[PDB]
Design a protein around this ligand. Structure first.
Ligand SMILES: Cc1ncc(COP(=O)(O)O)c(C/N=C(\CON)C(=O)O)c1O
Ligand SMILES: Cc1ncc(COP(=O)(O)O)c(C/N=C2\CONC2=O)c1O
Lengths: 275, 276
């Protein structure tokens, strides 16, 4: 059964509640991370928790607990779940922004859910993305503000996910890092424009090991017709092939050989980063 | 009076009201709201505010969890319970799931009632400074709960009262306000293609029409600010607040101007026509 750690107790997820005074509710002041398990071990736990601290600090939120304590809560909740888990620690703004311009009464909670991997068919067929002329502001901060990721699916024609394409420059997915494959090179946006993905970080290491050239630049919507493949990355989704962006088919519209090869190396290699 | 929250059919002490962490308002920032203020304990622009709330929900693919008539009912009852000048914020949440039909169909709602906090009289006397940034609100006619930039951005805002969205040097609006420039005795303000359709903004344009004051609905430019005479920002609670500095640029003589003070007096003399 799904759990939420809040106020020192693991609760059934559906019972845990947050006071409406909290500025996460009133004004969207919050940061979080998504951490997944393989063989019940958290992947990239320390990178995730360092990114959580980075997000909080960037947002003038004083940490309401140490990373060691969050690591403690996360391992214990995984053990309590007894299954592969997706774990989201949340840090809230809390009730006030002080005269010192800090949130010094932050609340925290951690959600534990049984992991929901995309359907095997999606890895076989690949997915479609809906491009929109928008961008994440302060992109290295993972805030709770995902509202664009949903509201944009009104005219998204059943797309799996939105793709942020400000001024025709591809930056990242609403929930993912985006990679294009052109003449057997990886192209992906620099961390000035996109979240510093944990999955993104592993894929660049796998590219270094495999002698695959990476260009850290925004791929362009106008380069898509010359691309062979595309995929998106995230801790739960792993590497998910992209076969269509808007009305533009990628390559011959099925997952490509380099995507499938990187996904196999990913699954073989990730033991190195289990904690 | 003590502050209240209407949630799950009951008026509660504000400090006791709690929302389930399953709600995507918490998890994913999926929410919309309005701020409604009172003058003489009557709500100002209640119907426009509630129509804008519904507009925000619908634009965000959120199915309204109550009728506007029901929300109006809850708001009037809470104001009566408060007995004092009140700021009222009805919130519509995404609720627990985004369905396969791409709608939030289990929305929650709640309404916060607080004693009004007007900006300090000194601010109206001296005016305030704004911090310009090269950013924009997306889907600008939707009033979401996402004001996180408005806070986090005050690390680099040098004590500015409020951030000013100035994408590519075009002034659109404040993080919490409509922005007005005054040049040659007429008003300049960004069109509602770019800025929230402010209720205060709407009253000020009607006051301008009544007074024969020209309004240009275009984005004022950072580069025009040296030639400007005055500037002010508008909002439900702040009314008209003079702006004497944007970034390092002084506006006019650096004190509140004659036309700003005139519109504020006509605003307060006229306000009763839009009470409900
Ligand atoms: C805006 C954004 N860009 C990239 C990633 C990928 O970062 P990574 O997970 O560190 O590789 C995510 C999270 N992906 C998620 C979680 O979404 N909150 C996934 O679980 O697939 C994201 O929200
Ligand atoms: C982004 C933004 N634009 C414009 C406005 C003004 O809209 P109005 O209040 O005229 O409908 C506000 C709210 N500003 C507020 C909230 O209520 N009191 C204020 O000063 C706002 O947050």
């Amino acid at each position: 059964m799904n759990l939420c750690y809040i106020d020192g107790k693991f609760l059934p997820l559906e019972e845990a509640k947050l006071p409406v005074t909290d500025l996460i509710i009133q004004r969207g002041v919050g940061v979080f991370e998504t951490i997944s398990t393989h063989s019940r071990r958290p992947l990239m736990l320390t990178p995730h928790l360092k990114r959580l601290e980075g997000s909080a600090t960037a947002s003038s939120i004083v940490m309401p607990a140490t990373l060691d304590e969050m690591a403690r809560i996360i391992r214990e909740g995984i053990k309590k779940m007894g299954c592969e888990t997706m774990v989201r620690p949340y840090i809230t703004g809390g009730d006030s922004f002080g005269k010192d311009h800090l949130f010094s009464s932050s609340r925290y909670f951690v959600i534990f859910e049984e992991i929901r991997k995309p359907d095997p068919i999606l890895y076989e067929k690949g997915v479609a993305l809906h491009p929109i002329n928008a961008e994440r502001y302060l992109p290295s901060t993972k805030s709770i503000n995902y509202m664009l990721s949903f509201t944009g699916q009104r005219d998204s024609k059943g797309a799996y996910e939105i793709l942020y394409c400000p001024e025709g420059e591809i930056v990242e997915g609403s929930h993912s890092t985006f990679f294009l494959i052109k003449n057997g090179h990886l192209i992906t946006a620099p961390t000035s424009r996109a979240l510093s993905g944990t999955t993104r970080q592993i894929v660049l290491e796998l590219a270094r090991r495999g002698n695959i050239q990476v260009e850290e630049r925004c791929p362009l919507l106008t380069e898509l017709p010359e691309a062979e493949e595309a995929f998106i990355t995230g801790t739960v989704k792993e590497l998910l092939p992209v076969v269509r962006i808007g009305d533009q088919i990628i390559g011959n519209g099925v997952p490509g050989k380099l995507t499938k090869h990187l996904h196999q190396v990913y699954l073989s290699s990730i033991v190195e980063w289990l904690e």
